[PDB]
Symmetry: D2
Subunit: 254 residues, 4 copies
């Protein structure tokens, strides 16, 4: 609809800005932390997205990973570049994420991968889409036929792949959280695990997976909410299995 | 050129055949286990390539992942679909690989990813390209500032990440050995490690990374060629450090 | 919904088949008569579509296999290739279209240009889209500021341009009616005129233009349908003026 | 090589800048000087191209399209947007052209269509390419088997279509002189006719057609050079037939 179409068009527009500097970034500093990085393109992409929202939705709030941090019953969650590292290195797996939350709940989410021309999205009650076509989670009911995936987390990823690679086809590490979550919704992977990360980071992939028919919970199997920190996105069919094994990795890591 | 131009065009043509079935493969068969598959599309794609080569180079030899394993002074090495599992699940990381080997040494190599429209290639003595433009390995001299990558091998993977994770920036597991290797010569990743592997998964990757200024040796450090069972591709500035961790991991196993 | 999604996916799939031969037709065929090979591609593309419609909509008339009824019937129109000349010569302006018609009314239409990665479409009542995002006809209400289009038709084209020449900004001849019609609903051109063509070749574009807010009438100015004898697609703002010149041109000729 | 690889990469980079605004000069900012916003995109793009050239080839002349008429040994001819009308309307047929001239002769040429991902180029003595593969002029020997092209020129286009229509297979009017001339070297069109356009805006195309084995002369039939005003690009198999037909049009005019 209105807000959704606006988002798709907006992220595709800004997506071209990132394409100009893709792989050719000069200023790269380690943002809030030490593991990840951030660039001047990050903020410039955010500024472009933020100016447009404020333009058509003046009385509404915004919340970026770095910079703007507001709260309201009409809130936009922006992540100018998810997979900054990939972006900087020239890997195509990076995306722009945008979610619209109203009255505390996610009403719609969009994830756009400039270099892959992949715009995945969904608005609650309307299903999940991918560049115009409907997407649904997979029907792979057992791990022997599943391709899972996870993020790069110290002490977690290695031991997680350690235990999982044995019971699945493959485990992928792509480098863009939002996209990977949307991929479960697209049905390209059967599950996606992401440890100790910011909750607002995946508001867009969450609604996409849920509208795609998937299941999203914390490492406890409990419905994923704004107070969860670890997330598990799946096709709902092999969730229990993934959850069990995830606690087996978190335990082993003390 | 003649053989290079021929190879680029042939792979691009066959790539469309694969696009038709991408993510919509009805039946997949387990070659040796559930982690090792192949499809009838692999076969149809190879046949298209084989038939074309036979037509213009009738007396030359052809060697493929399956079906044809000829030997000779003039040999063409084929991998119809490098990343079959990704291909079946609908992930974009899969490619067609071709290489012309003359007297044991690979003269030209072409790696084509249909979903991503990425054709990387190199001819002996002519440099490495990416869809017409020149590519060269990264200039990252420190492992900390590197993004390495590897395949999904049971036991070795979990261990490799485990070790490498505290030494690098990120480690990726995309799914296509040929592409993953060519990605090194593209400067998208700083190194790539392969455990247990055939010539058709890396003949094209060696020449690309080599003509792109990088290094390719077995796990011991010996400059390998057609095969060696173990491979390490890199920009050459951190090859030793990677070989160090690799031997650690492999010994930590045994 | 069900039909529209079915159609978007089916065409995006079959379009890849056309991409195999696209411009790959050797001159031995273009010289002897590319009519044959083109028909083999046409036949094969139609076969794949027909086979699928049979599986999902078993009791619906496909391309008049069960007659031609301007009222009281359910029909599926298939155009495997529109812009055949462009296709043969290697021009990217060619497409594949599918349209479902009920009682002479186009309920939904899809135009897919494989080489441009453009999927335009519309369902009756839901508006027109372009790869997931909404499209609408332009708002240029003065012929002198419009970009028009027509086909390379004998007699008609030379004159149509003579006229339009000073009355309008630019006139384009793309060589792809369906794509061209759709481009009107996308607001890329302000009006498109067709001289002596198969109505079923632009039925998909018909619904696309109307749902995008424009209008489509025959030369006599009557709203057009899938059986009309002539076509004029516009943004609905300068439609009367084009009909005028069109008829003037028709007078001059025959 | 150095200059050609730098140009290919440079045009591909700036191309995304154009994409950000492609078809994005809507009515809300169309009623607020849109021919000015397109001049900002142009100047901004021109600025990027100019800066990079100066940064790598410092003491070399730069005759930007909307720049100055410098003179010297080494000269770079730039055109930020060729096909401005299409660009403004959302049509994909627009390009960025760059030609490098030394000693008065064009040494290399690049034509990049951002919206189509088409990079056509050639180096004197190295032939023509299209995203890495070799391209060559068509092999059509008679006009009745050719698809010709020209632009939209008042008093000329009409008559041209008139006289050409009954001698040729089909004529096209796409809207981008450089892209269109390049398409002759790619073999998509058998010939192209421009009417009173500055040689500079067509220099990149000229080297592409010639390295592709084509023919480019002025309306008289003599080699095309800076003293030319009207051009004819062809495969060299039907050049004379075209010159003959074009001259008849020229007669009908005045």
């Amino acid at each position: 609809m209105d807000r959704l179409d606006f988002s798709i068009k907006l992220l595709r527009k800004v997506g071209h800005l990132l394409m100009i500097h893709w792989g050719r970034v000069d200023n790269v500093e380690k943002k809030t932390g030490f593991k990840d990085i951030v660039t001047e393109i990050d903020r410039e992409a955010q500024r472009m997205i933020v100016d447009e929202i404020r333009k058509f939705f003046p009385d509404e709030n915004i919340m970026a990973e770095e910079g703007i941090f507001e709260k309201g019953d009409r809130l936009w969650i922006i992540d100018p570049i998810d997979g900054t590292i990939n972006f900087v290195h020239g890997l195509p797996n990076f995306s722009i994420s945008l979610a619209y939350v109203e009255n505390g709940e996610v009403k719609l989410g969009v994830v756009h991968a400039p270099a892959l021309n992949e715009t995945l999205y969904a608005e609650e009650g309307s299903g999940a889409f991918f560049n115009g076509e409907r997407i649904r989670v997979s029907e792979n009911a057992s791990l022997e036929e599943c391709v899972g995936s996870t993020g790069s987390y110290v002490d977690f990823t290695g031991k997680f792949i350690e235990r999982m690679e044995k019971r699945t086809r493959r485990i992928r590490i792509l480098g863009s959280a939002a996209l990977n979550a949307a991929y479960v919704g697209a049905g390209r992977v059967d599950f996606f695990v992401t440890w100790r990360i910011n909750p607002w980071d995946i508001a867009a992939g969450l609604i996409i997976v849920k509208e795609a028919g998937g299941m999203v919970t914390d490492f406890s199997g409990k419905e994923a909410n704004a107070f969860s920190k670890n997330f598990i996105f799946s096709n709902g069919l092999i969730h229990d299995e993934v959850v069990k094994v995830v606690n087996e990795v978190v335990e082993e890591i003390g």
